[PDB]
Amino acid sequence: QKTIYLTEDGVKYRSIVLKPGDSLGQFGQVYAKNKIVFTADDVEDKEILYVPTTDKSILEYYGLDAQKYVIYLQTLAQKWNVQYRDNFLILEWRDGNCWISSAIVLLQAAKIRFKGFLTEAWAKLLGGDPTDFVAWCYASCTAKVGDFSDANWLLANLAEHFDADYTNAFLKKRVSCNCGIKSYELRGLEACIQPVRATNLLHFKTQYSNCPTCGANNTDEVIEASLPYLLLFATDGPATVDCDEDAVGTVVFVGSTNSGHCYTQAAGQAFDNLAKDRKFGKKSPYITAMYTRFAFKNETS
Ligand SMILES: [Zn+2]
Fold first, then answer.
1. Are residues 150 and 216 in the same domain?
2. 297 and 178 in a common domain
3. Residue 251 · residue 287 · CB < 8 Å
4. 257 has which bridge partners?
5. Distance between CA 270 and CA 164 in Å, rounded?
6. Which of 128, 108, 106, 157 shows the shortest CA–CA distance to 34?
7. By C-alpha distance, which of 134, 124, 208, 222 is closest to 173?
8. 53 to each of 2, 26, 91, how far by Cα in Å?
9. If you ran DSSP here, which 8-state letter would residue 76 be given?
10. Taking Cα atoms as reference points, which of 39, 22, 28 lies closest to residue 6?
């Protein structure tokens, strides 16, 4: 006979006694962590089991809707290994998980801090248990283990929970064409995450397009920035350029839009969880660059 602990959130529990005859159907659907459970025979005395929730406070705590939360719980069964590369934790490779591994290295390079559910999940990962954090990553992208997914989608998802000073995050841009010289400002999270043609500061600071109102070439320039962090995302696939030395890290993409592989560069090193011996390359096909405590002002002419 067994006493098991049921939880909707991983914080509040209720105990339940399973007599030798009983089954798990009585609880509705249940999920276990780092093991697979089909029947009450698979559950040990004092084991914790997780159940789905529709409670708005719990879902808002997690930052997931009810359907993503179900995927979260499903991915709790997985068992991952963390490995150490110098001072960085990497997620041991399997099943196309390099987009997640890459995000994990990059956020270490930035010394990111989280708020909410992800604070404890990240702390647990850094302590050597990646289960909760990795399950959240899959969930946020509605992804199954085995899926490859957009590392920049994942980072944008995580960024919503950064414990960053978004209040005073500020970006001012100047647009020039035959319509005139105009300016616009971005604040908070939308200011910190920036789509670019290629991920370095040169391409961030000046963008070239054609104006849809007049006929001419237009120039969109950064003239002022004060940001807790800056994420540059490639808009049209990987673009091969020199990274900036100022970046805390970058993400490299190799392969095709179908069979693609990600790895992170930081502290002058390549962290490829699939290829141990990959070398740092300053010029690489980048999809991501990250900067911390970024500030800039352009007063010319
Ligand atoms: Zn114009």
1. no
2. yes
3. yes
4. none
5. 26
6. 128
7. 222
8. 24, 16, 28
9. T
10. 28
Bond into 140 cis (ω within 30): no
- E strand or H helix at 177, and its extent? strand 170-177
What method was applied to determine this entry? X-ray
Distance, CA of 90 to CA of 100 (rounded, Å): 10
* Alpha helices for the chain (secondary structure H): 56-62, 66-75, 98-109, 117-126, 131-140, 151-159, 189-192, 201-205
Question: Domain limits at 298?
Answer: 169-301
Residues annotated in a binding site for Zn(2+): 177, 179, 211, 214
> How many other CB atoms are found less than 10 A from the CB of residue 36?
10
Domain match, 144 and 269 both: no
CA 225 to ligand 1 centroid distance, Å: 24
Q: Based on the domain organization, do 85 and 125 belong to the same domain?
A: yes
Query: How many angstroms is the resolution?
Result: 2.2
Q: How far lies 40's CA from each of 19, 23, 126, in Å?
A: 10, 6, 32
Q: Residues forming the annotated binding site? A: 177, 179, 211, 214
Specify whether 92 is located in the same domain as 31. no
Integer Cα distance of 109 and 248 in angstroms: 6
* Same-domain status, 204 and 157: no
Give the Å distance between the CA of 218 and the centre of ligand 1.
7
Number of domains in the chain: 3
Q: Helices 117-126 and 131-140 sit at what angle, rounded to 10 degrees? A: 130
- Here the tokens at position 147 are 């899926």
- Residues with catalytic annotation? 98, 261, 272
